[PDB]
Design an enzyme around this catalytic site. Structure first.
Site, PDB file in Angstrom:
ATOM      1  N   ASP A 191       5.609   7.211 -10.772  1.00 20.53           N
ATOM      2  CA  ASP A 191       5.893   5.815 -11.071  1.00 20.53           C
ATOM      3  C   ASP A 191       6.915   5.766 -12.167  1.00 20.53           C
ATOM      4  O   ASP A 191       6.743   6.468 -13.182  1.00 20.53           O
ATOM      5  CB  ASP A 191       4.603   5.131 -11.537  1.00 20.53           C
ATOM      6  CG  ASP A 191       3.569   4.916 -10.446  1.00 20.53           C
ATOM      7  OD1 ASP A 191       3.882   5.004  -9.260  1.00 20.53           O
ATOM      8  OD2 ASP A 191       2.441   4.514 -10.775  1.00 20.53           O
TER       9      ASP A 191
ATOM     10  N   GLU B  10       1.746  -2.172 -17.363  1.00 24.20           N
ATOM     11  CA  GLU B  10       2.292  -1.037 -16.590  1.00 24.20           C
ATOM     12  C   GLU B  10       3.025  -0.058 -17.527  1.00 24.20           C
ATOM     13  O   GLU B  10       2.626   1.127 -17.588  1.00 24.20           O
ATOM     14  CB  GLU B  10       3.153  -1.486 -15.448  1.00 24.20           C
ATOM     15  CG  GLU B  10       2.361  -2.079 -14.296  1.00 24.20           C
ATOM     16  CD  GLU B  10       1.473  -1.086 -13.573  1.00 24.20           C
ATOM     17  OE1 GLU B  10       1.472   0.143 -13.897  1.00 24.20           O
ATOM     18  OE2 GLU B  10       0.792  -1.548 -12.632  1.00 24.20           O
TER      19      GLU B  10
ATOM     20  N   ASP C  19       5.998  -7.601   0.401  1.00 22.20           N
ATOM     21  CA  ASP C  19       5.533  -6.611   1.424  1.00 22.20           C
ATOM     22  C   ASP C  19       4.210  -6.999   2.096  1.00 22.20           C
ATOM     23  O   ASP C  19       3.833  -6.344   3.095  1.00 22.20           O
ATOM     24  CB  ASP C  19       5.395  -5.218   0.799  1.00 22.20           C
ATOM     25  CG  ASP C  19       5.383  -4.045   1.836  1.00 22.20           C
ATOM     26  OD1 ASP C  19       6.260  -4.033   2.696  1.00 22.20           O
ATOM     27  OD2 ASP C  19       4.518  -3.147   1.701  1.00 22.20           O
TER      28      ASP C  19
ATOM     29  N   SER D 231       3.356  11.891  -6.166  1.00 23.02           N
ATOM     30  CA  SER D 231       4.361  10.864  -6.408  1.00 23.02           C
ATOM     31  C   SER D 231       4.423  10.560  -7.907  1.00 23.02           C
ATOM     32  O   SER D 231       3.694  11.112  -8.686  1.00 23.02           O
ATOM     33  CB  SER D 231       4.092   9.596  -5.597  1.00 23.02           C
ATOM     34  OG  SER D 231       2.976   8.844  -6.039  1.00 23.02           O
TER      35      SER D 231
ATOM     36  N   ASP E  74      -1.444  12.306  -6.068  1.00 18.19           N
ATOM     37  CA  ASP E  74      -0.819  12.644  -4.756  1.00 18.19           C
ATOM     38  C   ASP E  74       0.546  13.376  -4.891  1.00 18.19           C
ATOM     39  O   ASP E  74       1.199  13.688  -3.887  1.00 18.19           O
ATOM     40  CB  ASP E  74      -0.728  11.399  -3.824  1.00 18.19           C
ATOM     41  CG  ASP E  74       0.152  10.246  -4.354  1.00 18.19           C
ATOM     42  OD1 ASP E  74       1.048  10.443  -5.230  1.00 18.19           O
ATOM     43  OD2 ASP E  74       0.031   9.101  -3.865  1.00 18.19           O
TER      44      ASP E  74
ATOM     45  N   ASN F 267       1.219  10.692 -10.405  1.00 14.71           N
ATOM     46  CA  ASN F 267       0.034  10.420  -9.576  1.00 14.71           C
ATOM     47  C   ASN F 267      -0.517  11.704  -8.963  1.00 14.71           C
ATOM     48  O   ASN F 267       0.228  12.563  -8.619  1.00 14.71           O
ATOM     49  CB  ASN F 267       0.430   9.408  -8.480  1.00 14.71           C
ATOM     50  CG  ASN F 267       1.151   8.207  -9.070  1.00 14.71           C
ATOM     51  OD1 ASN F 267       2.132   7.671  -8.509  1.00 14.71           O
ATOM     52  ND2 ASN F 267       0.699   7.799 -10.238  1.00 14.71           N
TER      53      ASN F 267
ATOM     54  N   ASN G 105       6.653   3.231  -7.518  1.00 15.67           N
ATOM     55  CA  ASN G 105       6.189   4.521  -7.015  1.00 15.67           C
ATOM     56  C   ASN G 105       7.133   5.178  -6.038  1.00 15.67           C
ATOM     57  O   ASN G 105       7.688   4.523  -5.143  1.00 15.67           O
ATOM     58  CB  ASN G 105       4.847   4.212  -6.357  1.00 15.67           C
ATOM     59  CG  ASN G 105       4.138   5.420  -5.885  1.00 15.67           C
ATOM     60  OD1 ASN G 105       4.295   5.799  -4.714  1.00 15.67           O
ATOM     61  ND2 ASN G 105       3.373   6.056  -6.742  1.00 15.67           N
TER      62      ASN G 105
END
Ligand code: NA
Length: 129
Positions: free
Chosen positions: A52, A35, A101, A50, A48, A46, A59
């Site tokens: 990280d 990562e 989650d 967003s 979209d 990202n 995120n």
């Protein structure tokens, strides 16, 4: 801060991540290498909109607030910048929420593609733990 491999294992162990939700320490160290490279300061944007943040590339669409991800949630109740600290506490605490989650470590794409199913105990070999 850029961690060494064994130094980060130790840090993760102290913060209770070995065998959290059944995920051994090697899986967490492997996820952090692919990562971030073990950089706390790592940020990636990202498509979209967003971003990280940190060692575990968490995120801002769901997990932290950066002020620039419209409509997003902040489930970990932390500014995204706090994921960049030399002290990993906030990253670990939020990552415990994420793996809880429902999808486990598959939330981390580099884990699924580069660590899942591999000999992840190699990532802690040699370390005094
Ligand atoms: Na957010």
């Amino acid at each position: 801060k850029v961690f060494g491999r064994c130094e980060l294992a130790a840090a993760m162990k102290r913060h209770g991540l070995d065998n959290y939700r059944g995920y051994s320490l090697g899986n967490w160290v492997c996820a952090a290498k692919f990562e971030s490279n073990f950089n706390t300061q790592a940020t990636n944007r990202n498509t979209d909109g967003s971003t990280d943040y940190g060692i575990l590339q968490i995120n801002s669409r769901w997990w932290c607030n950066d002020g620039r991800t419209p409509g997003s949630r902040n489930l970990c109740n932390i500014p995204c910048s706090a994921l960049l600290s030399s002290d990993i506490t906030a990253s670990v605490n939020c990552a415990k929420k994420i793996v809880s989650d429902g999808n486990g470590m598959n939330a981390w794409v580099a884990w699924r593609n580069r660590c899942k199913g591999t000999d992840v105990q190699a990532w802690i070999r040699g370390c005094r733990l």
